[PDB]
Amino acid sequence: SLPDITIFPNSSLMISQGTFVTVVCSYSDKHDLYNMVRLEKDGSTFMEKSTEPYKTEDEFEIGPVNETITGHYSCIYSKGITWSERSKTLELKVIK
């Protein structure tokens, strides 16, 4: 194999205007328990859908991006009104 590189901190990403972004929400171990997944942006629901029946990843394609896409994002998995769990938060900054 070729070498790899990883840099920290990596929670804040730069994204060019007109880019297509893919957000991959994932829930190891517990995915079958939750029937909805939502992408939260800046404290409110941005996109949502039913979870995949047979994979543990749920993708949201966001593109082409503009300035409205700048913000903080997290994935929340839920069932009904009572149960929900959230991921870490990532920051996107869209640049022109």
Domain that includes residue 8, residue range? 1-96
Number of domains in the chain: 1
Say which CATH number the domain at 9 has: 2.60.40.10
Method: X-ray
Yes or no: say if 13 and 89 are a contact pair by the CB < 8 Å rule. no
- Nearest-CA neighbor of 50 among 64, 61, 34, 65? 34
Resolution (A): 1.8
In angstroms and rounded to an integer, the radius of gyration of the C-alpha atoms of the chain is 15
Residue 31 CA: distances (Å) to CA of 23, 25, 57, 59, 95:
17, 10, 8, 14, 34
Per-position DSSP letters for 38-79, written without gaps between them: EEEETTEEEEEEEPPSS-SEEEEEE-S--GGG-EEEEEEEEE
